[PDB]
């Protein structure tokens, strides 16, 4: 029976290695089948749960395997996935679209890319916050959308930077970086050169020039 324990250990190690390699941790799975035959037609109903890093999911679907003499065609006739109720509404509407399309692989790929970009955004915010406690006001949180950069001595001048993650109709994921300026008028009548109205385009050129963190570091040093 010791050898049997050896196979159990080997299988557990292989499962852990594969799960950490792909990034999907799969929980229990249940299959219930019903044979509805007229050329043979077989139907299966599946149920499995799991999670991917922060995100957790549980989904139920069924496939119709139309066996015949020369082809084995199986189509996912019905899909149904349910999400934990977070505020991430864009993920929910992507869930709705994928449910309408009835595609399973695309859902997993898009979920991976989404959570991956989310992890980058959160870690970048946390790192730049811990770098400069004195010039960063993380109003809503590191795992949230926007950022606030302000001076402690004076709250009049402040610029807000927004980081958003968007899922396209086709399925691919892409972020976008913009900013807004909370500026009192007194500064506007103060300086005549007045290039802050061009701030969006110039900021985007700067961030595309040499990177994201570099541009933010330069801006925060300039503000200080």
């Amino acid at each position: 029976s010791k050898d049997l324990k050896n196979q159990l250990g080997h299988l557990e190690s292989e499962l852990s290695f594969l799960s950490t390699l792909t990034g999907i941790n799969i929980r229990n799975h249940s299959k219930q089948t019903e044979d509805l035959t007229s050329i043979r037609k077989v139907l299966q109903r599946h149920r499995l749960s799991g999670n991917c890093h922060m995100v957790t999911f549980q989904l139920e679907f069924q496939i119709l395997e139309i066996q015949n003499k020369e082809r084995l065609s199986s189509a996912v006739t019905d899909l149904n996935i349910i999400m934990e109720p977070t505020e991430c509404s864009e993920l929910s509407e992507f869930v709705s679209r994928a449910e309408e399309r009835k595609d399973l692989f695309m859902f997993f790929r898009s979920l991976h890319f989404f959570v991956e970009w989310f992890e980058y955004r959160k870690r970048t915010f946390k790192h730049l916050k811990e770098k400069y406690p004195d010039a960063v006001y993380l109003s809503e949180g590191p795992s949230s959308c926007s950022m606030g950069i302000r001076s402690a001595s004076r709250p009049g001048f402040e610029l807000v930077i927004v980081w958003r993650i968007q899922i396209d109709e086709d399925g691919k994921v892409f972020p976008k970086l913009d900013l807004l300026t909370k500026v009192p008028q007194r500064a506007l009548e103060l300086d005549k050169n007045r290039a802050i109205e061009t701030a969006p385009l110039s900021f985007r050129t700067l961030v595309g020039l040499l990177g994201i963190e570099a541009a933010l570091e330069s801006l925060i040093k300039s503000l200080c």
Binding site: S16, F17, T20, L21, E87, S89, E90, C145
Partner: protein, 80 residues
């Protein structure tokens, strides 16, 4: 100690929050088209705030009383 008293005062002050929310017409003008509500992220809606906030209170007390407060190197790292 100080955490509860700030909770107590906002309970008596929350009623005024809905009044100023409903007195101003432009807040109600925000709803109606979903296109701006996409930018805010979900939607603008303040209807069951009173019901939701009071639920937080007793469960907060339960928290208080029950005291609820490279590839190769990566690949070889988990293989062991």
């Amino acid at each position: 100690d100080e955490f509860m008293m700030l909770l107590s005062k906002v309970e008596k002050l929350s009623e005024e929050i809905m009044e100023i929310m409903q007195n101003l017409s432009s807040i109600q003008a925000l709803e109606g088209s979903r296109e701006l509500e996409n930018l805010i992220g979900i939607s603008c809606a303040s209807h069951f705030l009173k019901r939701e906030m009071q639920k937080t209170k007793e469960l907060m007390t339960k928290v208080n009383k029950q005291k609820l407060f490279d590839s190769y190197e990566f690949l070889k790292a988990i293989l062991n």
